[PDB]
Amino acid sequence: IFCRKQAGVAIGRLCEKCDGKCVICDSYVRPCTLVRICDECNYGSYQGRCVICGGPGVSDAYYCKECTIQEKDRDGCPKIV
Amino acid sequence: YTIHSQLEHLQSKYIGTGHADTTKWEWLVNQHRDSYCSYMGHFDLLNYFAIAENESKARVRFNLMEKMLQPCGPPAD
Amino acid sequence: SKKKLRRMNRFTVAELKQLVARPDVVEMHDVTAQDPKLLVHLKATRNSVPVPRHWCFKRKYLQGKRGIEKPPFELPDFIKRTGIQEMREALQEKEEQKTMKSKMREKVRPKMGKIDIDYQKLHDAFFKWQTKPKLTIHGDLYYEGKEFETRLKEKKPGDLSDELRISLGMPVGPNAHKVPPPWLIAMQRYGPPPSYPNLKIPGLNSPIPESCSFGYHAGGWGKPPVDETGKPLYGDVFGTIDRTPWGELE
Amino acid sequence: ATVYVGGLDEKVSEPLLWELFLQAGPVVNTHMPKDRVTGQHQGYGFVEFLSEEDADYAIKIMNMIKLDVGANIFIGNLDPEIDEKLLYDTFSAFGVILQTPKIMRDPDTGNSKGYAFINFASFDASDAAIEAMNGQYLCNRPITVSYAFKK
Amino acid sequence: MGKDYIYAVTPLLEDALMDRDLVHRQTASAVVQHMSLGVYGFGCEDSLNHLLNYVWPNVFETSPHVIQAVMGALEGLRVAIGPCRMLQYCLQGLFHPARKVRDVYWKIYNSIYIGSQDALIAHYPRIYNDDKNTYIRYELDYIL
Amino acid sequence: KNLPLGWDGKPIPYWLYKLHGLNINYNCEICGNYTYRGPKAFQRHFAEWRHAHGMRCLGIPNTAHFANVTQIEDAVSLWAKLKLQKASERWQPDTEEEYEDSSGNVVNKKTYEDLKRQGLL
Amino acid sequence: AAFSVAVCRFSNTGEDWYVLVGVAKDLILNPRSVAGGFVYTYKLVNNGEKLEFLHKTPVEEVPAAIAPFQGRVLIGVGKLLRVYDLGKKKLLRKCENKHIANYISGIQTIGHRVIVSDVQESFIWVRYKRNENQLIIFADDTYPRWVTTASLLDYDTVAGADKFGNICVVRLPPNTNDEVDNGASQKAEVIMNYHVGETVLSLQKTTLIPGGSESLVYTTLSGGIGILVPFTSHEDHDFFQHVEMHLRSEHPPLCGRDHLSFRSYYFPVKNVIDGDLCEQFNSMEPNKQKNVSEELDRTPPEVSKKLEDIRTRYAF
Amino acid sequence: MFLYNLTLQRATGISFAIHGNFSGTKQQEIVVSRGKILELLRPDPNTGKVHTLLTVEVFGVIRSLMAFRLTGGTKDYIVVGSDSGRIVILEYQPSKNMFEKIHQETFGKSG
Ligand SMILES: [Zn+2]
Ligand SMILES: [Zn+2]
Ligand SMILES: [Zn+2]
């Protein structure tokens, strides 16, 4: 399930369990570009969380270079809410 | 099927997609509109047409955007 | 019933075949399609690629491959050459003979570096002898049993093989020209094809292949088949620029 | 159209069979639908050349292509220019060959004087083959075949 | 740096795309996906064409993992091989009698369309105009 | 019970018979009003012999273009327009390849050689 | 409306040149419709310093292309590819071929081959067998390409422009059964694919500066002029290959785009390096100039000189 | 074949233009767009000769070009809408003679 309400300028973050993988491609490598999320899945208790685990925002969700070659990173906040 | 809520949201997201029942009319008219939006966007096919007919870029894009409304005949039934 | 009135719109396959501009396409179920004029124009477009066979079938994709026995995959030459396969066969036989106790004994006291295979053998295979396999161009979907027939559509007569020559009685090599095969003999005797014929036999309906020999023993060309007035059986059984590429690497 | 591939060779593959079918004319079908047990060639096959005269002349051409109660036949005026497998296949059109054609050639040289004897399957087989090739067209010296003598 | 071993590996993937099992074809399809995204732009498109021939038949499938890896292989293969080739694979089954085949082809063409909807403008066929509509694009065949 | 044969020559059981749908018969007029049970059977028949013969004697080759056209008047009108198109797209030098005489006026290849070799040109 | 021109001397006559002009009649453009074509021959007199009219043969269509070919002229008139020889009442047709898909906007012909180039499908290789006097197809392309002009690079290779931006080079496979008798028999392959960026309206195989190696000049529709230049050594090739493979990654375009995808807009790139991205190393920044030239482990001198000199030996 | 692509003469035709004080002064600069090119000229008032200061590649299509001034600042930013799914914000550095990317916002797909 996806948020997909369109993108913004607020970076996303990763818990430490979820540390390292891309958001969708589920890679572990060659991350190129930073993730951005929507205000609605940006506010409040959802500030600085794990887009996947829900855990605390510590490490930065990133985008596997394949995902940027196919521009699957131009859709917005992909938060599994 | 919540996948489908999202997927006809996708049909609502991308004007020009299809589904297994889509009609030759919707298909070809959507491709025709897209053709127009790109003749406008790409700065050079505009010169191609401007020069092919003896019109001028304002004339050209005005025609195009008028045609964008019923480009491929009237509707199906 | 409204589907049934559109079903009365559901025209005849001859209706289609006669309407259409390209009739090769028209198939069985084409007609129960909501827009057969489209469907057929599409299927008659250039370069397009038709649906697989097997949407009709009740059996799933290769459950029909189920039955047979199949031989293991065959490596590329340039990888056999580097002699990996024998290393691996040897290690296999070793470790299938060895017993559990000895297995764990080797776990605790390893045979470190039993073998070696040096580099530049590998790096030259992969970077100096790697070569284009056989590929199939746009369109030729693989369907079940397709490999069941190795190759075809060489309707040409001159196409001969060396095992063909050997197991037919004819010669292999530079003599595949000057060797008229045992079928050109009855080509000269009673003819080529009645409605096909567009093939001429070398030494029987074509001229002498390079340095052929006329004579009636084993190893010659015999009587080039001719009429009683002198005109051959067909053709002539006796016999009477700058293609440089512009951008190319040094 | 339909042609009997007789003396159908075991390993002589249907692929090159169809390639010769094409090198003669309309290669439309090459089939030797074999035993349901063996897989190898079953002695008679169907070769369809979709033109009748095509198959006729292709047959005239691909004939002779080199694919104990006395069932041995003497065959003289013999063609010295043959090979073993080709001669065996030609003899076997009317039966099996329980002994390939032993050519009574001189031993001084290795070149024959024109006689042989061949163990076929049946005496009626030697009859039919020796009849169809009595005086008939051998390679260079016309054939002359019949029941064989005993040595 | 797959532009080197793509040739070595193809005859093994074609081997395992001619059936061996569900999981066999699911996995060979994943391999095709990643090869295509690696070899984007280095010209090894004949090899990915060859493997399209073998992957595309699995299009009618049911198992979720299998059809899903197939669809992934076709997005990868879409960037690596271009969207003409794949629109041509997707042409004839858009308007098919059936509905299982209509639906799979419209699923694919949807994903081919979303990404790279703008190339296709030069890849669409020529679809003649009947009586009361206009369907040809005369814009594109002005001479000059 | 009319139950179709198996390899071991027995009835085929009923759910299987229904699957194979033998009940449905196809009137192939080309084949001597032969009529076929089994759909893919029907289809392969179009290249089977009886259809081949039918074609030959119809006066029209067994090329694919008519396969699944089973009525003979349809076949002949189909092959009629097909004939027309083949003759069209043929380039015939007789009517196309055209020759001016010396006199500043033009004819075709045929008429040029005609009056050429019957003593003027 | 005159749309095609060629100067030719038929060999039945001598060195009295004639200009041929295609002149269509009463056209409309967005419907399509025509009245008819006419073939204007002029005798090009005053040693070639004024034309005097000879004849205007009527013909079926807008006669959009004329080509001098082996003592006669090939003419595209819409769907027809007809071979013409000369009279002074009219123009007489010695051959016809009728299989071209839509509309023949180009004819370019080597000593005895023809590369017709229709308006939508492709280049289509056509053969003239003189003794039977036939015009017969043997090899065409596998794509649609709305061509605007093509060029010959050899006996088997043809370069094409395209209305949407692209240039491509298409080559016949090396083994073509030239003489014989979906919709084709055997086809050609594509060996390069480049999205120039603007409509390319004329290619030409040429060398500019004296003794400079050969080249392709392309001249677009927006005031752009350029060249595509071969490589002689996998050392050069691999060099710039890596140069730009890094340049994309660390110095992307300004306007949001990706360079790989912009140059593979319609059909993917194949065997063309972006000299105009490479030549940007100069205007880059010392930090990045370092970083990349150190990946190459050459000095920014080595790179920049190897950049400049490759234009030096081809162009200016 | 293996080819190298070089442009001798840039595209000259003009499609879009804006005028603004793109160097902060009250000497005005003009930013025009060729096809896939952003070129900046400054017209000298003395002779009346326009010097083409900065000619840059952008590898895209400029579909839309509009300058803007912040409420009270002395600079003249550029907003470029091109054929990627992004809006981009540009500025001039005369110190380096180079266009500078302030911000960057994706909103969709390419082409
Ligand atoms: Zn991801
Ligand atoms: Zn949200
Ligand atoms: Zn987490």
DSSP G63-91: --EEEEETTEEEEEETTEEEEEEE-SSSE
Q: CB within 8 A of G26, min separation 6: which ones?
A: G34, G35, G36
Distance CA A11, CA A60 (A): 8
Distance CA C105, CA C239 (A): 81
Tell me the residue type at G231.
F
What percent of the residues of chain D are helix, what percent strand, and what percent coil, each to the nearest 5? 30, 30, 40
Q: From G142, F97, G167, A31, select the one nearest C49 (Cα to Cα).
A: G142
Q: From B31, B41, B42, select the one nearest B71 (Cα to Cα).
A: B31
Q: Name the DSSP class of C120.
A: T
Against chain H, the chains showing at least 3 CB pairs within 8 Å are: A, B, C, E, G
Distance CA G215, CA H101 (A): 37
Domain ranges of chain A: 1-81
Q: Which residue has tokens 């001597």?
A: F32
Based on the fold, state whether residues C21 and C72 are members of the same structural domain. Answer: no
Q: CB–CB of G199/B48 below 8 Å?
A: yes
Q: Which residues on adjacent β-strands are paired with residue G109?
A: G114
Q: CB within 8 A of D14, min separation 6: which ones?
A: D30, D31, D32, D45
Interchain pair H111, E119: CB under 8 A:
yes
Q: CB within 8 A of H25, min separation 6: which ones?
A: none
Q: From G78, G80, G75, G70, select the one nearest G39 (Cα to Cα).
A: G75
Distance CA A16, CA A59 (A): 7
Interchain pair H63, B41: CB under 8 A:
yes
Distance CA G237, CA F71 (A): 64
Find, in chain G, the residue whose alpha carbon is nearest to that of H64.
Answer: G255
Phi then psi for residue G155, to 5 deg, are -80, -20
C-beta neighbour count of A80 within 10 angstroms: 11
Report the sign of the C-alpha dihedral through residues E89, E91, E94, E97, in that order. negative
Report the sign of the C-alpha dihedral through residues C104, C105, C111, C112, in that order. positive
Q: CB–CB of A24/A12 below 8 Å?
A: no
Distance CA B58, CA F78 (A): 51
Who among B25, B31, B74 is closest to E124 (CB)?
B31
Phi then psi for residue C62, to 5 deg, are -120, 20
Distance CA C40, CA C49 (A): 13
E124-129: long-range contacts, CB 8 A cutoff, minimum separation 24: E124/B31, E124/B35, E124/E87, E125/C42, E125/C45, E125/E91, E126/C45, E126/G120, E127/B24, E127/B28, E127/C38, E127/C41, E128/C41, E129/B72, E129/B73
Find, in chain G, the residue whose alpha carbon is nearest to that of B50.
Answer: G221
Q: CB within 8 A of E110, min separation 6: which ones?
A: B10, B14, B17, B18, B19
Distance CA C8, CA F111 (A): 54
Tell me the residue type at H72.
G
Q: Is H67 helix (H, G, I), strand (E, B) or coil?
A: strand
Phi then psi for residue H82, to 5 deg, are -125, -170
C-beta neighbour count of G180 within 10 angstroms: 12
Longest dimension (CA), chain G: 76
Q: Is B49 on the interface with E (CB under 8 A)?
A: yes
* Protein residues with C-beta less than 5 angstroms from the ion ligand 3: A 15, 17-18, 50, 52-53, 55
Distance CA D115, CA D143 (A): 10
Q: Name the DSSP class of C232.
A: B
How far is the centre of ligand 1, averaged over its atoms, from the C-alpha of A26 (Å)? 5
Who among E110, E129, E137 is closest to B18 (CB)?
E110
Q: Is H63 helix (H, G, I), strand (E, B) or coil?
A: strand
Q: From E102, E108, F81, select the one nearest C35 (Cα to Cα).
A: E102
Q: Which domain holds residue C104?
A: 67-135
- Best CATH choice for the domain D73-147 from the list 3.30.70.330, 3.40.50.2300, 3.30.9.10, 2.60.120.260: 3.30.70.330
What percent of the residues of chain C are helix, what percent strand, and what percent coil, each to the nearest 5? 30, 0, 65
Helices E45-55 and E64-81: crossing angle in degrees, nearest 10, is: 150
Distance CA G253, CA G274 (A): 13
Q: Which residue has tokens 């997909």?
A: A4
Based on the fold, state whether residues C83 and C32 are members of the same structural domain. Answer: no
Q: Name the DSSP class of H56.
A: E
Based on the fold, state whether residues C71 and C125 are members of the same structural domain. Answer: yes
Distance CA H5, CA H16 (A): 26
The tokens for F66 are: 């008519």
E28-32: long-range contacts, CB 8 A cutoff, minimum separation 24: E28/E55, E29/E55, E29/E58, E29/E66, E29/E69, E29/E70, E29/E72, E29/E73, E30/E69, E30/E72, E30/E73, E32/E73, E32/E76, E32/E77
Q: CB within 8 A of G279, min separation 6: which ones?
A: G307, G311, H6
Angstrom CA distances, C108 to C90, C103, E17, E110, G50, stand at 22, 9, 41, 58, 101
Interchain pair C246, G154: CB under 8 A:
yes
The tokens for G115 are: 């590369």
Quick one: how far is CA C108 from the chain centroid? 53
Q: CB within 8 A of E33, min separation 6: which ones?
A: E69, E72, E73, E75, E76, E77
Interchain pair C160, D52: CB under 8 A:
no
The tokens for D85 are: 């497998």
Taken as a whole, chain C contains a residue count of 250
Q: CB–CB of B29/E137 below 8 Å?
A: no
Burial class of residue F84 (count of CB atoms within 10 Å of its CB; 0-12, 13-18, 19+): exposed
Chain G residues with CB under 8 Å of a chain C CB are 111, 121, 142-144, 153-157, 169, 171, 182-183, 205, 214, 216, 228, 230-234, 237
Q: CB–CB of G293/G303 below 8 Å?
A: yes
Radius of gyration of chain H, Cα coordinates, nearest whole angstrom = 15
Q: CB within 8 A of G100, min separation 6: which ones?
A: G76, G79, G80, G81, G116, G118, G124
Q: CB–CB of F80/C18 below 8 Å?
A: no
Ligand number nearest CA of A16 is 3
Angle at G195 between CA G189 and CA G199, to 5 degrees: 105
Burial class of residue C3 (count of CB atoms within 10 Å of its CB; 0-12, 13-18, 19+): exposed
Interchain pair G88, F104: CB under 8 A:
yes
